[PDB]
Write a protein that binds this ligand. Structure first.
Ligand SMILES: Nc1ncnc2c1ncn2[C@@H]1O[C@H](COP(=O)(O)OP(=O)(O)OP(=O)(O)O)[C@@H](O)[C@H]1O
Ligand SMILES: Nc1ncnc2c1ncn2[C@@H]1O[C@H](COP(=O)(O)OP(=O)(O)OP(=O)(O)O)[C@@H](O)[C@H]1O
Ligand SMILES: [Mg+2]
Ligand SMILES: [Mg+2]
Ligand SMILES: [Zn+2]
Ligand SMILES: [Zn+2]
Lengths: 295, 38, 297, 78
């Protein structure tokens, strides 16, 4: 794979495909990218930071199981009595399988950064005129093991989320689609923006995707990393219509079920794209890119 | 119209879901499904 | 009426689960400044690694975590069955039942401590050089202990400096970090004491391990009174592991003996909460020396 | 009893012999003798087996397991 040569400078094996320790070099660029993204934040945007886990009931309510049940990581634990736990530990001691004593907690590993913001917004009552904007980030998890450096199981996501009338969200997404392309250009990256679909699970899912692409509810900024024929989506621009507004009873300034949308930056994919494009020697990066990143 | 794009008339995702389902109710159709043929 | 509870309004938002909170911009700005201050004290030659919130289950099992804190471990499970089985699980959910019966464990756990993944990484490099190795590691950690107290989270940030070498390399390292960490706490204007302590091992035999740990003085904590001076909150720890990880991972020091290890751990969320409890949630009203040390201006 | 005492010193001396040797006196602290954690675990079991009793978890403490003296004071109180 074309990205493989980057591994030695960027990552250390943690004994599991798609789960890597990050070197100081790699993390310094993730951090500069995060700061660059922050510097483009629209005024009036509330910044929240989420932990890597969230409420299972909240995610269930958001409908994640109808779309990507195969990707979800659930948190489980030994919730039994001391006797039960002791037997589990005893099985392990003998080289047996202690994991049969696991049961699910009330938490999952977050599959996207924006999910927890919808109930938070809803608890504040009706939206002001012009809607609400959030800046959120989380370490996310998706159960898709791969050896490719651009397909991780645990990865950082940063999102700007808009909640408001259809016009609010639509204007928001157009601003960000232009703005994201300008950022990518300033970073010296090669890309195109195209219609896309989320990878819905199963038969019905395949038709959800067609309909998603047809309605143009999702654009991606695609960067050629392993090939020009199969580029890597490093950002997405998502329009959810009234799905979350209805789900969470959020109503806009006009008494209608709010529309929502988000712009998502895959922080590890952008960093990997930067190293693939510019190499692992920062002093050699183009001067305009170094300046843009404050290097 | 039998030329009008399916999504233009107002068939969103859940509509298209039942549309794949409805076309099953007619014939041997078990449809996998691709963007072009819709 | 916990004395910390009033801090929630400015610092956190509920995420529908005790010990799991969204962090406000105010809160995160201080965690980040605390992180930068700790970084400014990093010793030259210390290798910085950043770990994700999950790690290899096999690695964690091998390190002995189950025999110590089986009850705190969070495992990753997923729907690993066929498409038919997964669709059935979701349909049971749709019909008011429990989809989670279709879950099975993955090969990953949520990391209970930042340092665990570093030992196999060190081991893979062969014999330690003289003087040993030093690491700066960080991770979002997870411990299954729900609580409504803002100083006891289920998901929290840990920053550690780790030493791997001879017993002398490690005790020298721990000695110097105990002094420096106290200086940092002092610079932060925090009230604290440092005392020996033990890890909450599990079960009856676990009690004896704890006794021995306290007797051998393998663990110090920097304790800050948040709710009371009677039950203070451990915000840093200074841990000596003896040869446990060296033997487990086959790490040999420069004399060919099984390496000793130790770490100094900073609880980033606890330190931040300590700061807001101590100095209040108005940053402009913080002491000038504290604002200076944190580069708040 | 001098029985409990000399017997405790034996199991302490037996576990000690699994690595090295030293001088074991009643007021000497067990940790100073050289007992590690698995030693203290093994010693607690070698005592619970020797005297046909179970130590209440409430009594598994540094106070009672400080020295041979403090230990016999615990064994004998049962
Ligand atoms: N497995 C992954 N590894 C790394 N980054 C990822 C991964 N999945 C998603 N991201 C990043 O998160 C962003 C937002 O998430 P989104 O759900 O839009 O991804 P996606 O549409 O599933 O993609 P793909 O077809 O690339 O797997 C993506 O644009 C990408 O940059
Ligand atoms: N539940 C938690 N919430 C927040 N921070 C924590 C939590 N557990 C540990 N930490 C922080 O991270 C460090 C972890 O090292 P350590 O394993 O020594 O914790 P601990 O000994 O379990 O603590 P405690 O007695 O408070 O449960 C602690 O010093 C503390 O600052
Ligand atoms: Mg994905
Ligand atoms: Mg604990
Ligand atoms: Zn989103
Ligand atoms: Zn540690």
């Amino acid at each position: 794979d074309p990205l493989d040569h980057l591994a030695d400078k960027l990552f250390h094996s943690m004994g599991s495909d798609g789960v890597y320790a990050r070197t100081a070099l790699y993390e310094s660029i993730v951090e500069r990218l995060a700061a660059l993204i922050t510097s483009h934040r629209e005024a009036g945007t509330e910044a929240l930071r989420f932990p890597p886990v969230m409420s299972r009931a909240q995610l269930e309510k958001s409908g994640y199981l109808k779309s990507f049940p195969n990707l979800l990581g659930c948190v489980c634990g030994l919730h039994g009595t001391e006797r039960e736990i002791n037997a589990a530990v005893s099985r392990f001691d003998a080289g047996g399988d202690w994991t049969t004593s696991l049961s699910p907690a009330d938490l999952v590993l977050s599959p996207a950064a924006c999910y927890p913001v919808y109930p938070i917004a809803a608890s504040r009552g009706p939206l002001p005129k012009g809607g609400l904007r959030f800046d959120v980030a989380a370490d996310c998890f998706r159960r898709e093991p791969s050896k490719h450096l651009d397909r991780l199981q645990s990865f950082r996501m940063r999102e700007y989320v808009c909640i408001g009338t259809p016009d609010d969200v639509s204007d928001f997404r157009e601003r960000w689609m232009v703005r994201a392309q300008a950022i990518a250009r300033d970073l010296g990256l090669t890309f195109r923006v195209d219609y896309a679909s989320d990878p819905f699970f199963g038969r019905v899912g395949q038709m959800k995707a067609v309909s998603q692409k047809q309605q143009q509810l999702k654009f991606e900024l695609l960067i050629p990393l392993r090939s020009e024929e199969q580029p890597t989506a490093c950002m997405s621009f998502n329009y959810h219509r009234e799905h979350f507004g209805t789900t969470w009873g959020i109503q806009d300034a006009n008494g209608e079920p709010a529309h929502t949308g988000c712009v998502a930056f895959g922080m590890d994919r952008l960093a990997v794209a930067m190293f693939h494009t510019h190499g692992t020697d920062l002093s050699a990066w183009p001067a305009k890119v170094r300046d843009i990143l404050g290097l | 119209t039998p030329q009008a794009k399916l999504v233009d008339v107002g068939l969103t995702s859940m509509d298209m879901v039942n549309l794949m389902l409805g076309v099953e109710a007619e014939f041997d159709f078990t449809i996998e499904i691709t963007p072009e043929n819709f």
